[PDB]
Design an enzyme around this catalytic site. Sequence first.
Site, PDB file in Angstrom:
ATOM      1  N   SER D 229      -6.590  -1.230   1.353  1.00  0.00           N
ATOM      2  CA  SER D 229      -7.830  -0.883   2.028  1.00  0.00           C
ATOM      3  C   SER D 229      -7.810   0.571   2.500  1.00  0.00           C
ATOM      4  O   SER D 229      -6.755   1.100   2.870  1.00  0.00           O
ATOM      5  CB  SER D 229      -8.093  -1.815   3.212  1.00  0.00           C
ATOM      6  OG  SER D 229      -7.153  -1.605   4.254  1.00  0.00           O
ATOM      7  N   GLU D 248      -4.502   4.584  -3.450  1.00  0.00           N
ATOM      8  CA  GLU D 248      -5.507   3.942  -4.294  1.00  0.00           C
ATOM      9  C   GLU D 248      -6.251   2.987  -3.377  1.00  0.00           C
ATOM     10  O   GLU D 248      -5.709   1.944  -2.995  1.00  0.00           O
ATOM     11  CB  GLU D 248      -4.862   3.207  -5.473  1.00  0.00           C
ATOM     12  CG  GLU D 248      -4.313   4.118  -6.552  1.00  0.00           C
ATOM     13  CD  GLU D 248      -5.394   4.695  -7.462  1.00  0.00           C
ATOM     14  OE1 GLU D 248      -6.579   4.359  -7.290  1.00  0.00           O
ATOM     15  OE2 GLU D 248      -5.040   5.486  -8.362  1.00  0.00           O
ATOM     16  N   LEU D 249      -7.474   3.345  -2.990  1.00  0.00           N
ATOM     17  CA  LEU D 249      -8.183   2.593  -1.972  1.00  0.00           C
ATOM     18  C   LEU D 249      -9.432   1.938  -2.584  1.00  0.00           C
ATOM     19  O   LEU D 249      -9.407   1.524  -3.758  1.00  0.00           O
ATOM     20  CB  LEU D 249      -8.459   3.518  -0.786  1.00  0.00           C
ATOM     21  CG  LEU D 249      -7.251   4.379  -0.352  1.00  0.00           C
ATOM     22  CD1 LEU D 249      -7.649   5.400   0.721  1.00  0.00           C
ATOM     23  CD2 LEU D 249      -6.027   3.546   0.124  1.00  0.00           C
ATOM     24  N   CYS D 284     -11.705  -3.458  -6.124  1.00  0.00           N
ATOM     25  CA  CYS D 284     -11.958  -2.145  -5.553  1.00  0.00           C
ATOM     26  C   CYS D 284     -13.042  -1.379  -6.284  1.00  0.00           C
ATOM     27  O   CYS D 284     -13.505  -0.362  -5.760  1.00  0.00           O
ATOM     28  CB  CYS D 284     -10.699  -1.309  -5.564  1.00  0.00           C
ATOM     29  SG  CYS D 284      -9.698  -1.554  -7.025  1.00  0.00           S
TER      30      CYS D 284
END
Lengths: 476, 477, 481, 476
Positions: D229, D248-249, D284
């Site tokens: 997140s 990597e969100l 995502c």
Amino acid sequence: LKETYPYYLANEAVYANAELEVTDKYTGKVATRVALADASAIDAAIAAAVGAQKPLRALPAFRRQAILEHCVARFRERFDELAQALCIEAGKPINDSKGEVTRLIDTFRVAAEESVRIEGGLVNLEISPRAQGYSGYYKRVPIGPCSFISPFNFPLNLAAHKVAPALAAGCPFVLKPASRTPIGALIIGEVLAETDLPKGAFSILPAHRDGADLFTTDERFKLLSFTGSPTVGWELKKKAGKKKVVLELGGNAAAIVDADQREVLDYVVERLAFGAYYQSGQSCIGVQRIIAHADVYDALREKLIAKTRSLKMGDPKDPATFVGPMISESEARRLAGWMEAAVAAGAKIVAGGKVDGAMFEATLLEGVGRDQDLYRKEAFGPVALLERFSDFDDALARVNDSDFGLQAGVFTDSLSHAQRAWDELEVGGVVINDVPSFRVDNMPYGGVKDSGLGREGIRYAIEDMTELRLMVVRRR
Amino acid sequence: MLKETYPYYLANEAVYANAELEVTDKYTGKVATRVALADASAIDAAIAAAVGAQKPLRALPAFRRQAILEHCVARFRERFDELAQALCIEAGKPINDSKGEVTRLIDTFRVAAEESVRIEGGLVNLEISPRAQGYSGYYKRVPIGPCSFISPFNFPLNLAAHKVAPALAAGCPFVLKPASRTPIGALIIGEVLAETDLPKGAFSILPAHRDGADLFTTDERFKLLSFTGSPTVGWELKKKAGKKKVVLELGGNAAAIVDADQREVLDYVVERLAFGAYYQSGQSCIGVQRIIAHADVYDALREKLIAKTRSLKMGDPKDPATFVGPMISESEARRLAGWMEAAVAAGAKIVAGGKVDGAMFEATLLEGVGRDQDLYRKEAFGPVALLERFSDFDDALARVNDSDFGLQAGVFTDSLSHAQRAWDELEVGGVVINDVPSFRVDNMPYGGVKDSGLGREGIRYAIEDMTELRLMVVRRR
Amino acid sequence: HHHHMLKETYPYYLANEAVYANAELEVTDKYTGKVATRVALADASAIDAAIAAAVGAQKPLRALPAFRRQAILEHCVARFRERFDELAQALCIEAGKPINDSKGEVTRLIDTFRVAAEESVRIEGGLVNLEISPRAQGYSGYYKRVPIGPCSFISPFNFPLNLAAHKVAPALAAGCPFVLKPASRTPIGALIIGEVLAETDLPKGAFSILPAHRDGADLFTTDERFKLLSFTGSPTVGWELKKKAGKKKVVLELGGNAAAIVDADQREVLDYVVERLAFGAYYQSGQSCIGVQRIIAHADVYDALREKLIAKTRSLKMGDPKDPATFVGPMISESEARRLAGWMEAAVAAGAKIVAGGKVDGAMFEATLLEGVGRDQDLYRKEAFGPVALLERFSDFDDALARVNDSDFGLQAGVFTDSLSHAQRAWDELEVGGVVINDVPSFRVDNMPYGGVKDSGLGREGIRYAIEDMTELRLMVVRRR
Amino acid sequence: LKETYPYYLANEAVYANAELEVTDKYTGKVATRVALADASAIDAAIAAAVGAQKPLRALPAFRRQAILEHCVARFRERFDELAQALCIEAGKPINDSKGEVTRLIDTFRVAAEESVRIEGGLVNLEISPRAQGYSGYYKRVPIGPCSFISPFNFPLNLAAHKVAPALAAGCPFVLKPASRTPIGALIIGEVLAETDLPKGAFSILPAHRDGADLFTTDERFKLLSFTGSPTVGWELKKKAGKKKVVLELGGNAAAIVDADQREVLDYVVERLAFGAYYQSGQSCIGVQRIIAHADVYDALREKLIAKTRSLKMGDPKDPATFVGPMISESEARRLAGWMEAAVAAGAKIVAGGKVDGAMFEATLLEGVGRDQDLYRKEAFGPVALLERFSDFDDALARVNDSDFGLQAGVFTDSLSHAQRAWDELEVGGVVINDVPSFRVDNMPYGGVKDSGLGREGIRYAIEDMTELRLMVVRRR
Ligand SMILES: *[C@@H]1C=CN([C@@H]2O[C@H](COP(=O)(O)OP(=O)(O)OC[C@H]3O[C@@H](n4cnc5c(N)ncnc54)[C@H](OP(=O)(O)O)[C@@H]3O)[C@@H](O)[C@H]2O)C=C1C(N)=O
Ligand SMILES: *[C@@H]1C=CN([C@@H]2O[C@H](COP(=O)(O)OP(=O)(O)OC[C@H]3O[C@@H](n4cnc5c(N)ncnc54)[C@H](OP(=O)(O)O)[C@@H]3O)[C@@H](O)[C@H]2O)C=C1C(N)=O
Ligand SMILES: [Cl-]
Ligand SMILES: [Cl-]
Ligand SMILES: [Cl-]
Ligand SMILES: [Cl-]
């Protein structure tokens, strides 16, 4: 071996005839018979390769990869069959034959990886006010139908170095293997025939050089890629017409042994013997000339005579055999004639030297004049020539004293000597601390001067089998 | 005003060997200057000097080669009006377009100056199998050797530059044979190069007529022949080249598609079509010869294109108002007029222009030209364009490809999918989207497939053909 | 051609334009101690305004085609050549840098901008084959590099022109707006660059150059509108700034205690080796992030190298950096000379011996050579950043490599050898950003990838590599059905 | 499933305890128990990773490739086992689970190919007289020990995007999988344990976030690579210390439907429903915002309402299920609260909308104000929002109207609109004629703005796990 083999016309086996006899190069007896393609069949193959351009181009990259990976898996399963057939048709010692099948698999494996990696690019076109708003994109498209001609001495791997890139690049092709050693190509054909390649994507057609005119002259081929002797290759270039021409030829490769090598002479000698005598010197990068510094010459000479005399000659099916037969008695007689002339002119045979039929001993000579055929022409047999130098620039000049320029090797721990060799040796590749005979199948490979025109090695062959297709986009 | 006589350049030096080659003003037809004509003895001497210059030239560091190219850029800028005026005289090229080509000459040498310090080398991972453990691979590019260069009449400066500047960047000695009708530009390039500290023998620039130029193709000391010119000549020279590498930059009958969605931008499209078809009187290897326009825009495009074509001013190329100067000769105008007459006799209609007076060929537009006519299928190389109509985009693509040639094509469209299809299916060196096929910027990969060429120019791509990979394999144990 | 005088006051540059906001920042001649000039000191309100203008300039700056950015860079090159003496003399005064080496740095300033001018028209994009599996049939990939956003630049005192140039010039090539904070001790060169940059048609807000002391520079690290912090300076500061940077990408160009190995085979070329060692150790009085601090010499050449190096070190002229004969100018301050002198005194007290030089008078520190410094000494393990070098002896080449690596740092190392296998082993085993073969670790050319590992840095400069950090990949995936 | 799983400490299974219960996300019952690593075990793993650096760096590339190929072969063998484990611990519909296992194989396959072609370079340094005689060579070396943190939603493939590059690059690593979904990572560990990686090269250690401080703060790690997140990722960057950070969100990805899409609306709607509702929107790059042109808005709205209602919600073990449970009832309550707030401010639910525990229907809304949490925060559930535009610049501005910037999609046949989308959308990746939910595992992948820092995809991850090591050579 099978009793008969077909040729492959537009992906399918055709038992058209049994006219081409393939002999066991050691026993001289006929080992099998294969179908010999005539001009009508070659023409049919070219016509079908033209027809397969569009279906073959529509294949996504992962499908091409899958096709190559099927070849890899089947070459693995059929490993010993391939090696035994190579042993018979090429006379190649069984351990060298297994070496070649390992390389065949390597070559297809690199091609499988490269098939999903073919280089495209972006170019910035906004280099001047006139070009404001323009951007550039290029991708590689198949060159078109390819004509492939391969030689006798690596009948699997040197065919692989054209076939595998063509599959990765999406070019239909027609391959003419060497008439003396067509079996390996026809086993590749059988494996390719099992894949879902579009019909016409490949034909493999045995044909004698005297019936092979269409492979050079037909205007429907967009590329001629030839591996073989310098005399043939340069002649084919003259008759190719409009098509692109790639040539992989031969030479009289040299290895320099530098002044600093005393402590590692056993290593150097072992590699020198491999390079000069493996598959009986029948390598386009076999060691023919050994240029040894005066400081190490005496110990090197003694060790090299001993090692050379120790190499077992005989039945290539015997794992203990290092020196098998040459490809024919006539080729042994050619080389024996050059050797005898060198001797009559003052040279000395210091190891080996006996010739019986195609059985040519591993042989080392001293005192060969640089004007001798034995020095200047491609020996392509188990002969090596030892000479002595004291100045490194003189050693470089000696390597370069040749019509050829395929590969050279230098055994040295001098950084500046390695740098100077890289700069000054007019060859395709310089090998440091191994013989010129070394090749790995992803590396760029080929010759300059009379030794070739272009590079093989998977990535580099794909380059020659494709054309840049630029897109310029103007935004306003 | 030109000099009364020009030398040739033998091993970097001006030689006023003779004044045998007369160069005419292509508009007045009168002799404008005389230049030295190289015989076979001089060409042989130039080749020997190039062989000798290989090692000194290879010894120059990259920044020295860059400095040599930058000196050329500065001098070309300095002599900008001189070069354009000479081009205007010897090529009959309208003065504004002559100035345009001098600008390109500068760009080409500028790109080469940049590329000279960034020539590609590489590392190769060789440890792909147990046998190769401990090996590493390094490669660099070395000069291929002495280069033979042959350039044509129509872009005498820039097409010579696309060989000369890469050779300077790469370290190859070269011998250049300019077109005998237009040798002055190359001889001015020679004067500029002669000012630099290039090793003697690094360059020769030798005017010679084709019948005296056999050595440029056959001599075994050349390692590359790079030819720019007509397809008929180029493919014959390839046959006689011997062992050397051959690069060919030839011509074609370039087509432009105008798609169904182009209504709102037709004035832009027509302007580019007229530029492409009639710039330097159509004497461009990527001149617009065939215009393939969608039925939805055809009537409005036809009316606009006729009006545009008829508006183009023809006359004295020294006049800045002139857009259509003379063709290179009356005989070439007669060649094209014969194809035009044959096409009209077979049913085609001239809808604009069509009048020919000596070498003055009007900007001319036709409809109804049969696809089997010489006017359709051969390289017009004159101010003639052919208009045809389509409705199916695949038909338009097939018509573009209906040719012996494949240099460049252009597509005016805003359809993403049509652009994708054109890039995929047009068998050409380059596809231009929303400009004519006649567009070129001097860094881009440029060349033809099919009968239009073999290989690519544009600085980086020319350097690549002028060099050989030299691999170093290093075994550590 | 002529002796220049500094302006009485210098402005700062706010959104491309000179502001004579004040004259609060005094800049001293580092040799005479006398105030040389005064420049405008930016407060937090001015920094905020510059950041805001940088945000606003992104879209206009992005809209410039490549050839326009090249012409901007070429203008700077042309003007730096015209103002070569002005820049060299200002550098000589504000950094106390010997004038011949100041001229050398102005030459590098020019080279760095020239490389950026060339790279501005060849910023890499690419094609990607995406058809690697049945699911992705018909997909194709294209990527180009776009500006990362507004950039925060912080530069140090010692190479003030060229180390600012290694951030400014890539930013101009890549199309990033930036705010540069030079070293307060040496701001003049940065402000002359600002004047030159103000002449170009860069969009307003594309650059600001704001002098500010460290205690008033917090926004250069913490403001969220910056997308990149690129810092060149001391390790202690750089790693602390990374901690406070927040979301932004961080690039660090720090220092170290660089070593040079002299191998057993160098006897015939010892005069060349000694010349390069002396240059690397004592150039700009050792105030270089890749200055030679440790010399590790093979026993076979040790005695001959030692005698030649002592003689060479003794020959180096110390004095006024305006004197062209001077090679060793003042260190940047008396307190820094005192720092280094104390480490030296501690090393001697533990058994080391000064074998050349060693006299310290104010900020004037002699080029000094020591033997027998223990590997645990501050003089060995910390960044000297002064005209001191340490000589030690080895025989086993793996022991030499271990000694080079015996450090918190890892910027560059040098190896003088004609042994192919030793050069390979050094390339493989030295944990540094760059290994130099047959020159000192102090060598740098402005196109090469340059930076440190371990405590010496994070990231690479050199034009192409800095552009890569100032840009983001923007991928386009296109599906055809 | 096994009754208990070990963790992997320095390449070895360790049944340290059975403290971490893993639930079936659909039934809520405990499915298995796994060993939970404490701070002492994490410390030992890090120490072992430091010790493994030199043995791991000593491995030639072909050995790394063989290790990765072993993983590929075992993942193929254990394909159904992996998919069923994923289906249980993540509640992921079984067809989607088999999809992720296929991706896991793709990711490792790409890494095996890349392991033998890690880029090095030559640089021309002779750009000024000062630099005459210098040449430059650089290669990539491991950055050092890597700290890897992976999330719950793609437990296999998002861990693979760190593990496989590390193996290719020669970095030792310690991986902390998500505590709710650790089984996949532990099966990967069991397969990796079979290989001849040096001891210490890998550890895989379940630990709750509250006991995971050392994965961010330990200075022996040289790289932290986190996927998860945005709120956690940016916090971890602030505490990472000296190490390089890769993030990597997530985001609130948008898909534009242009005015010309009427003839392919069934395709567009199909891909929209896939991107918005696949694994219940827990992606995502799941489609959260749909921006549709007035010209096709009414026809798209009708077809999309029908499509959304057709999607079967239920037991993820049933292959007919498209919408499985969300990861927890609290995550459903979070999204349902945002949904209710947007409805209370005037939005309308036009399809779906029912929530029962963790069973959240595929849901479509209109009229969601752009200031709503439902609009601006990451929904991470099966909710999609439909809005309307006429000017293309307005549609682009709406996509960028976000804190986030991972990927966007544009359905158009306008060349200029696609070019403008590429230029002006501030995202890592623009997808043309598919949803932003598309990813292939070799492509550069990541976000800008609050969506990430850095790129994954095998080649790009390897770049971040390596350092350039330059060699400058001076010749005189
Ligand atoms: C690596 C390894 C070796 N070489 C070079 O190969 C030759 C030795 O091989 P060899 O088969 O004896 O060469 P070749 O030139 O006689 O024949 C090769 C192939 O060409 C065909 N062929 C000959 N002549 C023609 C004509 N006129 N038209 C078409 N095809 C022709 C041969 O046909 P067959 O009659 O034999 O069936 C055969 O297929 C050495 O010189 C060695 O250096 C090169 C290598 C490399 N660089 O990769
Ligand atoms: C592609 C797919 C998804 N995403 C983004 O992921 C999240 C949803 O995943 P989630 O597991 O719910 O995220 P998270 O941040 O809560 O946890 C992820 C991992 O981090 C660990 N963790 C949390 N907090 C800490 C701290 N303080 N220290 C160490 N480790 C921590 C979690 O530990 P557990 O307690 O759960 O075991 C877990 O391992 C969405 O935002 C989505 O967008 C990103 C993708 C991409 N871009 O590749
Ligand atoms: Cl221009
Ligand atoms: Cl092997
Ligand atoms: Cl798939
Ligand atoms: Cl210089």
